[model samples]
Target: FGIKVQNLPVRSTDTSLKDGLFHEFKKFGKVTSVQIHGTSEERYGLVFFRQQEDQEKALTASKGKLFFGMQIEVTAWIGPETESENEFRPLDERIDEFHPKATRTLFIGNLEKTTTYHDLRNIFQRFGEIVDIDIKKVNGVPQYAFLQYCDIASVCKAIKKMDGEYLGNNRLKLGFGKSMPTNCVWLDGLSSNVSDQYLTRHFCRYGPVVKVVFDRLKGMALVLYNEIEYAQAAVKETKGRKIGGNKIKVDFANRESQLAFYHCMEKSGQDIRDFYEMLAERREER
Candidate 1:
């Protein structure tokens, strides 16, 4: 059986193509071959596995998931014709397969070399209040930008209406941006009264935590590890384990744009430590 992956990155040197595919899919079973197809605007690939069960395992694990801020679609390879056809189809046609609720940030691409912050805000503000925008420049020429909205509704509406639309004579290519890195884990269902010290003492046993930020309102915490190895160890060992009578859930965090948001928060006079203090205050109030 074959596994098809949609919304894979096209230009990053880190994409790793076959090696990355082999690394991720090999966990299921033996992967025979991986073929990457499509153009810059739409990129996807196919993986052939030695056993049908391996394909099923991959599809079940990866379908409707986030990778590097892009929603990836994993499905049973229908055939070569559809693969060839869908690979180059307009991105709007395949946007449905994206994980829309994954993040409130949008990855805006195909920007004109001359597009500026003022030009973007005037257009994007129609959807909602944009909290931040990080533009990407290649050789001093504008290529893409990441826009974070105040709410997910604005993000969904903007993607629905603006994706594939033209901006400054260049067709806009929009997708999700900056999913939580593999070195980060999101913990949820925590006892609202849990303290940062309690979290650190328990989680530090797995590895050195780069940072731990809690959201008492959601009973969620974003824990960053110094390495993906430690993050993976924590996920394997801590997932479904209990803390303070709650069976906390541990999984990879899917923050829309972790570093960008962190930077933005820093610019706005907030930092990761502020969240920990927020957690402490809420616990004391309780």
Candidate 2:
């Protein structure tokens, strides 16, 4: 999931720069997150996996996979709980004056449910060489997650071009989670007919919806607004709003609460788009 670019020269500029190492990582399992660390020269990075099985799988496939242009170092990284964690700390944190230009990591969530590791790779590889992905899991729910680009310039390019737009049917919601502050919200008491468009129309009247998700089967919905400002507006306007004679419940969708919802359901980002939108389309389907 991560790499070192090194000054290792390629045979030609025509050589497909991304195919070897990155593509190789996909076969082991779904890569929900990636982060790359690098200098002004080549790229260095780390990727996170959902299961320990995947970490082990990556170690098996990645160790000694020397197709990288240079004599690249590919190894398992342990951080926080492990002593070896220090080996992979970002260069800036390690060297007092060592400020290498690294990419600004963005948590890109609400991805196309049909999105796979390959789809994510295809979408983001265009940004710059992706360093690693931090596949996020809150409680157990697979809410949206982050993708770290190799270069700040590439991150900026993606933000400029991709923010506040649709990628497949999923609206790509981008945010800076420097501290991962909690911004969860809840909505309830709808006709089981509330679509993203319906939620957006209602919520956007106050401010735009950043993350919109729910279970129509349970007659519940969760919509995260841009921030506390709009969140308060959402709470104020709809907390007691009646729907079908039921006052809908509306508030934050915190991580601790949504745990039971996470699954490989995204199937490495594969089937969710058709599933959710199919639910959405039933409004027209019926």
Candidate 3:
């Protein structure tokens, strides 16, 4: 997030005044850019920083400060498109919850044309197996990739090691990713020793199992099925089974279902999971 300041006392017509504005914000942290728009009638200063925490300090110190006969109002800037009143939504408010701290998936960008799944696999393979690499494409060009790990520990190491590192002449931009609906079922509270093949063995009896990813740090794992109904059947029949005397929590690993589990769901079920499934079905029908 960046900070926006209004009521600058200087004349807006002078582009040189922007240099003065940049100096004021530089004290907070690394100022990426300083862009002040509007004529003298109504001018606003949009100061962006490299670090989000830097904006917090600037907002705290500069807001309500009497500067050059003007008291500047400070606010967090979402983007430049929101100049009109009531058009911007608060950052805290969203349709779904953000990924938890123990999230295993990584969102990466700054991709090049030569970027491939193998390039990512080579880097992420060391962190953990069950590394599902996906490259988001525009037309046929690679835009970004999502690197998913089975365990939180491996992902933690992977991000810290390669977040700013170079991959094919492009800097790796990595962050945690949110869950989406797929042929996967998330089950938590499994015994730490639960192996992927063992999980695959358990789940494959119902249908064709593609892979099983165990998050050993959280004692959770997700079973991916070759078909959607395979996941449906596995989730329905498997939550009550005790693995090493530990009762497991199971649900579809989609955004709606993740919200349902974290926001409002219980083991005493049939209502919650069924509701999310219904929502997912209706979503695609439109």
Candidate 4:
């Protein structure tokens, strides 16, 4: 029997369901396919593997595991004696309870072709926790994107705060991201000597910092907040801003794929020189 997983966060607006399994289950072995049989709120799914050993290994490893910010329940699947013996719920009876409720989404219009996801996020993140944003494109032209929030109240707040704000040269129009967290920010470009106390002292002005942790090996720090709005404000106000002659980069937690991709694609001759200058400055400061 294959393994069944329960308690997965299967909200409509969240994209974790797409990549979560692939990223989490690949370590066990080659996952043949993943099928989500039930509704979003039910949070149960089936996973198939190429080999029985793989399935067993996966079951052993993930039988009691936590994923996607929740504890998951995994167990061996058992089917009825025969296909004819199986009974299924009626379609109406199996309807998702959240279907009738309103979603926390916003529709943004009049986006500039050069408007990056970072810009869009910076504008809307001040109101609440952002689930994700889907930027639509046609013929390589930027059309509009859906910005999903974690709460409808935050969506309403965003509409009031940023409905008709001018973003760059384009006037932005905000409506509902009907797609769909404590807010956290990834801070990079810190001096090795920078301490948590220093980070707390500086970052506390914008919001109540819940915690600050540093990965000295990775040379990065993560600052967490009690509220998403405060985290958003901190990112907008601090990103690309100078700190002790260094331009620190602030971004949403683990959302640096675009930045890394851009850095690789747009390598410039001045980058090496700039790095060396900063290295020399760090040495001199020490």
Each candidate's lDDT (Cα)? Answer: 0.72, 0.53, 0.67, 0.65
Please state every model's RMSD to the true fold in angstroms: 15.7, 21.4, 14.0, 20.5
TM-scores for all predictions? 0.41, 0.28, 0.42, 0.28
Q: Any idea how many clashes model 3 has?
A: 0
Comparison by lDDT, 2 against 3, better one: 3
TM-score of 4: 0.28
In angstroms, how far off is 191's CA in candidate 4? 1.3
Which segments of candidate 4 are over 4 A away from where they belong? 1-182, 254-286
- Which one wins by lDDT: 1 or 3? 1
Please give the RMSD of candidate 3 to the true structure. 14.0
Predicted structure with the largest TM-score when compared to the true one: 3
Provide the lowest-lDDT 10-residue window in model 2: 94-103
lDDT of 4 by residue, 26-52 (tens): 688888877666677686777777788
lDDT of 2: 0.53
Residue pairs in steric clash, candidate 4?
105-176, 105-177, 105-178, 106-176, 106-177, 107-176
lDDT string for model 1 (102-153, tens) is 3556788889988999989988999976777888897788899978775455
Question: Tens digits of per-residue lDDT for model 2 on 56-170?
Answer: 8777665545654455556666453453234222223232111122223556776654555666666777876565566565656545666654324555566556765666786
